Nucleic acid binder design. Structure first.
Length: 91
DNA sequence: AATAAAAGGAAGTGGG
DNA sequence: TCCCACTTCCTTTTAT
């Protein structure tokens, strides 16, 4: 299937769910979730993966944190803010 | 305070 | 079989 970072990047590069997620600095890959609207986006991720349960922002961030080990997505020390690697922003 | 976020271990799921 | 890439579940810590 489709990887979570890819799903997120595709929404950012096509501008859907701007009420739920947006660039903080596009050229640096840094993006941010909305406090109020992030659950619509979590829900959409879970629908698209066919998961048994309703996907939530907390479970999605749990996955997001695993990218910290590999490097695709780094947590920034700002509320609800993350950062794609340069490698991810190419392909 | 209070509370939303961040954290992360551990066993579970799909599908290749 | 095994491994990947999450997903689920829960308590504890940290940041606002």
């Amino acid at each position: 299937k489709i990887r979570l970072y890819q799903f997120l990047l595709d929404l950012l590069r096509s501008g859907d769910m701007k009420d739920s997620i947006w660039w903080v600095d596009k050229d640096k890959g840094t993006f941010q979730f909305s406090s109020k609207h992030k659950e619509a986006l979590a829900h959409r991720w879970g629908i698209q993966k066919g998961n048994r349960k309703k996907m939530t922002y907390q479970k999605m961030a749990r996955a997001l944190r695993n990218y910290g080990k590999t490097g695709e997505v780094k947590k920034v020390k700002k509320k609800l803010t993350y950062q794609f690697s340069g490698e991810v922003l190419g392909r």
